[PDB]
């Protein structure tokens, strides 16, 4: 057979590693994971004490 | 959003400290009212913020002839509320009179903790319908609340007189204290002492010490109630928002109560539920129909497995409901508590309105006519002819239930359109 089979195995060997360790960097430094589920309390207006709060003085408005 | 819980009566003062024991030992609070480093949740619903980080709780202790009150004095968390609220019968009329000459002092102290908070929204009454101390001073209390704060919503965590009796004056008391609680009343969150104490019977043999474990059962349900406001939820973090589902007419203010683990003092959710439409599990003993289903869970819940499960129970077809309006059954999530040993981790609550109620609201009816129409139960009571001496406020308390229970029946019917 003709392929790569020597070349690309220090290669894909590599990309794998890269790849992961990238993801890991975002979720157990930087807390990626957490402004997601921050985002979702004020957003969505998960969170009570705050869309019972904005909206009724909102509305009172218009 | 805020609430202050008021206790009157030895057995409602009993089933108050019961509740801040167990917000006690639910949240992360010391017996001082000192702080935990565990304590994030929201403790502004029934403590009130103090001073040095204390959650001091928002109670108001009120008694009528202390005994039991000594004995709650006589612990180490009557040292983690009561931020000076201290102050010193059998019959309705006798209960009512004593309030009656008192009014003035008890509003002052409901006064201080009316202007001491930041904002208010209902009021808790706990004590016993026909107990005693809690009878006609509850009903004279509740005209006042009502008289003096309209802006507010009332919730009534009371038992009602299911104990098959000697006190036999017992029917007169509660049918008074109910007109009061039919007019001057939002919710009344309604229990049988006979079903709570046939399943006390049923997970341990108890004869003697039902009461203590039917206190911890009304203390999980009205934790379980605010769990989702002092929790992080979504809805019903208004209590309003949560009375509004179930009462179509505020006549009709009555809910059913059942909690799904039985062994309380993991499992599929639309078996939980159709285990919670059991009377085996519901805590009250022709074809009567459902008004309005709505249903609290909090424990160990698969995400989706909500709309499969309501779903399922939908096409099981097995409650039968009320031919005039559109009313649903509606799932409701809420977060099991933290900072507390999870165990039993399925627990559901249901707060529905039934005209089931109504058959046992007709059996005290029935009883207080013939003990009213064969007069040798009533005996003519000084404190009654003094309060009454003409004795028309039973007939109109039995105007009131007729008008009730008229109200009842056209409403399983569908003719509710029209008034009845």
Not at chain 2, 257 to 266: A, H, Q, S, V
């Given at each position: 057979?003709?392929?790569?089979?020597?070349?690309?195995?220090?290669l894909?060997?590599?990309?794998?590693?890269?790849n992961?360790?990238?993801?890991?960097?975002?979720?157990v430094?930087?807390?990626?994971?957490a402004?997601?589920e921050?985002?979702?309390?004020?957003?969505?207006?998960?969170?009570?004490?705050?869309?019972?709060?904005?909206?009724?003085?909102?509305?009172?408005?218009? | 959003?805020?609430?202050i819980?008021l206790?009157?009566?030895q057995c409602?003062?009993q089933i108050?400290f019961?509740?801040?024991k167990?917000?006690?030992?639910?949240?992360?609070?010391?017996?001082?009212?000192?702080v935990?480093?565990?304590?994030?949740?929201?403790?502004?619903?029934?403590?009130?913020?103090?001073?040095?980080?204390?959650?001091?709780?928002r109670?108001?202790?009120?008694?009528?002839?202390?005994?039991?009150?000594?004995?709650?004095?006589?612990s180490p968390?009557?040292?983690?509320y009561?931020?000076?609220?201290?102050?010193?019968?059998?019959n309705?009329a006798?209960?009512?009179?004593?309030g009656?000459?008192?009014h003035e002092?008890?509003?002052?102290?409901?006064?201080?903790?009316?202007?001491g908070?930041?904002?208010?929204?209902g009021?808790?009454?706990?004590?016993?319908?026909?107990?005693?101390?809690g009878?006609?001073l509850?009903?004279?209390?509740?005209?006042?609340l009502?008289?003096?704060?309209?802006?507010?919503?009332?919730?009534?965590?009371?038992?009602?007189?299911?104990?098959?009796?000697?006190?036999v004056?017992?029917?007169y008391?509660?049918?008074?204290?109910?007109?009061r609680?039919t007019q001057?009343?939002?919710?009344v969150?309604?229990?049988?002492?006979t079903?709570?104490?046939?399943?006390?019977t049923?997970?341990?043999?108890?004869?003697?010490?039902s009461?203590?474990q039917?206190?911890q059962?009304?203390?999980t349900?009205?934790?379980?109630?605010?769990?989702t406001?002092?929790?992080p939820?979504?809805?019903?973090?208004?209590?309003?928002?949560?009375?509004?589902?179930?009462?179509?007419t505020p006549?009709?203010?009555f809910?059913?109560?059942?909690?799904?683990?039985?062994?309380?003092?993991?499992?599929?959710?639309?078996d939980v539920?159709?285990?919670?439409?059991?009377?085996?599990?519901?805590?009250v003993?022709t074809?009567?129909?459902?008004?309005?289903?709505?249903?609290?869970?909090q424990?160990?819940?698969?995400?989706?497995?909500?709309?499969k499960?309501?779903?399922?129970?939908?096409?099981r077809k097995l409650?039968?409901?009320?031919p005039?309006?559109?009313?649903?059954?509606?799932?409701?999530?809420?977060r099991?508590?933290?900072?507390?040993?999870?165990?039993?981790?399925?627990?559901?609550?249901?707060?529905?309105?039934?005209?089931?109620?109504?058959?046992?609201?007709?059996?005290?009816?029935?009883?207080?006519?013939?003990?009213?129409k064969?007069?040798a139960?009533?005996?003519?009571?000084?404190?009654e002819?003094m309060?009454?001496?003409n004795?028309?406020?039973?007939?109109?308390?039995?105007?009131?239930?007729?008008?009730?229970?008229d109200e009842?029946?056209?409403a399983?019917?569908?003719?509710?359109?029209?008034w009845?």
């Open positions: 057979v003709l392929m790569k089979r020597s070349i690309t195995a220090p894909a060997a590599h990309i794998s590693l890269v992961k360790a990238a993801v890991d960097y975002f979720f430094e930087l807390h990626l994971e402004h997601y921050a985002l979702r309390h004020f957003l969505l207006m998960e969170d009570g004490e705050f869309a019972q709060s904005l909206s009724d003085l909102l509305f009172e408005k218009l | 959003r805020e609430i819980t206790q009157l009566g409602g003062n108050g019961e509740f801040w167990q917000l006690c030992a639910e949240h992360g609070i010391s017996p001082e009212g000192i935990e480093e565990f304590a994030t949740d929201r403790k502004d619903v029934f403590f009130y913020q103090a001073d040095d980080e204390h959650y001091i709780p109670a108001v202790l009120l008694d009528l002839e202390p005994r039991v009150i000594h004995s709650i004095l006589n968390y009557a040292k983690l009561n931020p000076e609220n201290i102050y010193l019968g059998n309705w006798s209960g009512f009179s004593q009656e000459k008192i002092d008890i509003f002052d102290i409901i006064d201080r903790e009316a202007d908070s930041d904002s208010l929204e009021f808790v009454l706990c004590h016993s319908i026909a107990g005693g101390t009878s006609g509850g009903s004279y209390l509740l005209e006042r009502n008289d003096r704060y309209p802006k507010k919503l009332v919730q009534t965590y009371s038992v009602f007189p299911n104990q098959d009796e000697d006190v004056v017992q029917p008391n509660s049918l008074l204290t109910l007109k609680l001057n009343a939002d919710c969150v309604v229990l049988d002492n079903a709570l104490n046939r399943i006390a049923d997970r341990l043999h108890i004869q003697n010490p009461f203590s039917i206190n059962l009304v203390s349900i009205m934790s379980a109630s605010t769990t406001l002092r929790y939820g979504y809805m019903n973090n208004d209590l309003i928002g949560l009375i509004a589902s179930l009462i179509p006549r009709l203010h809910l059913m109560t059942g909690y799904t683990p039985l062994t309380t003092d993991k499992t599929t959710v639309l539920m159709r285990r919670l439409l059991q009377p085996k599990n519901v805590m003993s074809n009567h129909c459902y008004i309005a289903i709505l249903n609290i869970i424990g160990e819940v698969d995400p989706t497995q909500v709309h499960s309501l779903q399922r129970i939908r096409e409650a039968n409901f009320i005039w309006g559109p009313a649903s059954i509606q799932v409701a999530l809420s099991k508590s933290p900072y507390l040993p999870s165990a039993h981790r399925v627990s559901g609550l249901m707060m529905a309105n039934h005209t089931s109620i109504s058959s046992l609201f007709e059996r005290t009816c029935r009883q207080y006519d013939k003990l009213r064969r007069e139960f009533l005996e003519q009571f000084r404190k002819d309060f009454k001496d004795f028309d406020e039973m007939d109109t308390s039995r105007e009131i239930v007729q008008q009730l229970i009842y029946h056209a399983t019917r569908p003719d509710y359109i029209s009845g």
